[PDB]
Symmetry: D2
Subunit: 114 residues, 4 copies
DNA sequence: CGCATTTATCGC
DNA sequence: GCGATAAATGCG
DNA sequence: CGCATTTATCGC
DNA sequence: GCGATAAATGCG
DNA sequence: CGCATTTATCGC
DNA sequence: GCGATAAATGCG
DNA sequence: CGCATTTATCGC
DNA sequence: GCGATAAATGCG
């Protein structure tokens, strides 16, 4: 199924964060309404932050995360969690290799902010 | 109920990350087996990373997250999510004020690494 | 923090389901906009369904779940999960005793329907 | 990625529940260690329970859920959630059609029991 | 015509 | 913890 | 004034 | 897999 | 050799 | 809320 | 006595 | 994508 696509409230400030756990060079791309809004690129095998950002839903709220590595797009896993019906997490994993750990690029979206 | 306490596999490398969304000065404390293992302190209202870290479960796996602010401990919300039965997230929110947004200190644990 | 309270889209059909895992007699109560909409009562220690139902968000969407047992309200744990940004789960646990398993009354809300 | 596969503690009692939200006739199949352990079959478009069951992890814990409809296997979405580090949910959605609601067969595993 | 007027939410 | 902000009728 | 008119979503 | 449904101007 | 002996967890 | 249950040395 | 010996997992 | 790693009997 379609992974890494989330609908958050229209025109809402949120935070994006990505980590790396692979020898491959992660090209994390964050779209908003099918528009590129941010691009993190880095390499790590020790869960290093390759990018943080504050963005805006726009006035759809269609945030999507794509993860390419060296050109080859990765396969994605995603979910959204809400605590106390206020604090939201949007979680994205990704696999570039074959050992199925899906941590090569870990993306964490969260909102509300402030 | 008890929040911010997680049991991850014995002796396993994981990553801890904290953000701030409050005028209050977040004192994030990360215990392992009731031992302090890491202490992040910072202030932000723009979801800034106040700390990243690679730690070890030890040989219980009892990771706990506590969040004090200016002395006053915050109330916590927590959950653990697993994708494709391999990639784990342990999420912690916290409230220091009264507006119940619970984003003042957002803590994100993830594993496996590498 | 406040548990067992969820905001789902205005005027939306969803399903409620409750289970029992305690010698105590679970009085599961499902409010909508602070109005009682359904009341399941039963007893089991073998995860028996004590009630299923199709309800409507109304035109707020404030669905709340309360769990009393023999009069004494239980302490609640809750979260909401979304898969493929379409299929929603709202999960509620509850504790009437002291052994902290929180399965005495397990409540599962899901939507969309059809 | 691989969906509908969960690893729960060895030799542990849990509950399986399935719902239906499609004109298609859902053949929910629940394997344990790649052994069929339970088979629910039913039809509904009003979120009807097509099966409940108490099973055992066995001594691997590899519980898998497969969903065929009229022969054609469905595409799956899955996740596991844990509250207060005690109460576990394993959630499975599935799509037999093309409208991508993924509620046609909703499967809910939960543990511990008692 | 467009543009000010009239307590829950967002932003530093 | 604070203050600035924003479907109908009236008006420039 | 209220009430029909004009492709994405919900319901059996 | 199918069909019925629903911010502005026009009208009864 | 196999089989009883010696406080956290599971089952009705 | 209750009680029955289960890595080493000793033994039948 | 302790210490090497004998394909799924973790670490850079 | 790679290689180093780790319940019983044997032995120093
Ligand atoms: O696909 P191949 O060139 O390899 C890379 C594997 C990659 O890095 C290693 C360290 C591991 O973490 C794996 O999960 C990644 O996919
Ligand atoms: O409790 P009081 O001194 O205030 C602080 C509120 C705090 O900061 C603001 C910006 C808001 O984000 C709120 O959520 C925090 O609790
Ligand atoms: O609080 P006390 O009268 O007891 C009841 C415990 C109750 O039932 C048992 C079976 C157990 O499952 C526990 O979790 C429940 O709280
Ligand atoms: O695939 P086609 O024969 O159709 C069936 C659609 C099916 O039922 C309807 C009611 C809807 O709920 C859809 O989600 C299901 O896939
Ligand atoms: Ca990988
Ligand atoms: Ca990896
Ligand atoms: Ca706050
Ligand atoms: Ca805040
Ligand atoms: Ca209990
Ligand atoms: Ca119980
Ligand atoms: Ca469908
Ligand atoms: Ca359906
Ligand atoms: Na006033
Ligand atoms: Na037409
Ligand atoms: Na004794
Ligand atoms: Na060999």
């Amino acid at each position: 199924a379609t992974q890494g696509v989330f609908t958050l409230p229209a025109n809402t400030r949120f935070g994006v964060t990505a980590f790396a756990n692979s020898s491959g060079t992660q090209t994390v791309n964050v779209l908003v309404n099918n528009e590129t809004a941010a691009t993190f690129s880095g390499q790590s095998t020790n869960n290093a932050v390759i990018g943080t950002q504050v963005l805006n839903s726009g006035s759809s709220g269609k945030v999507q995360v794509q993860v390419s590595v060296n050109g080859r797009p990765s396969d994605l896993v995603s979910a959204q969690v809400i605590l106390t019906n206020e604090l939201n997490f949007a979680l994205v994993g990704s696999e570039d290799g074959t050992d199925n750990d899906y941590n090569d690029a870990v993306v964490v979206i969260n909102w509300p902010l402030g």
